[PDB]
Amino acid sequence: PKPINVRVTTMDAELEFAIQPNTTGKQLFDQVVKTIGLREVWYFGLHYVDNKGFPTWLKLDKKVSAQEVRKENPLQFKFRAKFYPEDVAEELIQDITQKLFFLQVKEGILSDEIYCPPETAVLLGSYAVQAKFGDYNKEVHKSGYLSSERLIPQRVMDQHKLTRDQWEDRIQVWHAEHRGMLKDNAMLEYLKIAQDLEMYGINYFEIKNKKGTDLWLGVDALGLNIYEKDDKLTPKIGFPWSEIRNISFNDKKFVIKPIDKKAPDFVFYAPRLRINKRILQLCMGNHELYMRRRK
Template sequence: MPGVTAAAPNNAAEKSPKMKMQSGGKKVLARIKLLDGTIFETPIDKRANGVELLNIVCSHLNLMEKDYFSLTYTDHNKILTWLDLTKRISKQIGDAQLEFKFEVKFYPPDPAQLQEDITRYQLCLQIRDDILSGKLPCSFVTHALLGSYLAQSELGDYDPEEHGTNYLEELRFAPNQSPELEEKVMELHRTHRGQTPAEAELHYLENAKKLAMYGVDLHPAKDSEGVAIMLGVCASGLLVYRDRLRINRFAWPKILKISYKRSHFYIKIRPGEFEQFESTIGFKLENHRAAKRLWKTCVEHHTFFRLASPETPSKRSGLFPRLGSRFRYSGRTQYQTRQSLIDRPPPNFDRTLGKRFSSRSMDGELC
């Protein structure tokens, strides 16, 4: 380090289905599913890069700490893919309809260090999605605690006359929500009296960040013995899971180099205290695209969380083959976004957690 080297071969651009254009041919209509479940539509230039669309969405949401967020789309292989913000959208989507999801890409290890409540609120929405989809497993106790903070954020102080006994029916906070769980949430909700929505959301995030799978991007793979595993990329490094249990962890400072070749992904590890030589560990992914996707995810997470600023293509060395991928993470790093102080009054915004989950009409419309 200080940075992980990331060698990789070239790969031809993928093609997808047909783009839907508005009349005139100069603009295309993009539809984005936001984290509150609503659909935002906007015309964009057909030659626009991904970052232009992300900026429009963040402006619509009044978000300034936008570096933690990005857009996903479903490619022609039915795989959810992050939009490359540096490239023209049409070259990535091909002729497909421009339908995206706005999501958290980089989960901050310490949400309290985010500068604005509106950013933390969007992170709460993402974590709720992760919990409801099963991506972020929780125990009964944790479901109850997190649900109680969401209730406080959305509904305010518990009022027996206003809320009654069934007031949580419209608030979804767990994938298998039961009367027993709702009763526990109501019991805990009563203890949060006096907390503002922003305070309740911060408590929610402070507890969510402790969950084992918080911010972990999982990729199915096989180890050197052909055993099925999951590789997880997160702020702290690369994690290895087998049967839902973490069996290994490679922190970014321990990793010297990441690379992929065909369907194989490799990490070169620093020698330990009593070791003399570096070691290379290999994993087999489903195919070349999956290996490259994992490699790119590692490059982006390492750069965002570990480096003060992104590496530039001019910093190429003998470790990078001439025909290797030129991909680098080009956005701001976490260090840079924290250094960029926001100077504005706290923006007003609507909290729509209850509205979102009292209606499922938007489900399945996008991606």
């Protein structure tokens, strides 16, 4: 039948090939991972922009052609991590997987999505520089060698009095300390530091309690967190996956039901059904992976 042209990018590559009207999301996903030689498939998914302009995750047990992908030639998909390990250093197996996590997390730090304090930004940048440039080399890494790099999150640059040049100098000092460090190990060290950031690995959603107070829900590899609207850093209430019997989803509502029956149910409301559906998907996926690491 009539071929459908698609294009899939990962953090550092683009793939372009054709699929058929009957091709399922799983079949497309399978073609992608096999092409790049990635086997740790449980972390990843394909997202696309729907016909209304909303980023959406591709459903694997459904025809690609049946999912309202923005109609264009080629269809555009991004292959990205949807789930994060609990500890990158002990769980990730392949260099490719580790690289794609490094690139994706670094993107979120450099875009200011993931709050990073200044000294951490400098340490992180030093590993990214070691990964990209290799060992510091006086001979070729002369002043301004970091001039065209996005090194530091803009919000960090903005809340301080240092200049671009001075940030570079701080990174260079740390870059010099990493001498001999192989690229894959620099990426791993980067991820070990980022993992410790308070906003790392969390999807945030606007929600309200029954009182109508505006809050945030965070969903991550470890469980659920409830935050006050003005502070995404420090949870007010935490619900580890180990402590959750069930999360019921009814229309716009959610109800977190504890394993400990002596604890009460916690009820929340999300503003749009679209968002609620995605909360459900992330809860399901993270809970499922949580069980695996333990058994």
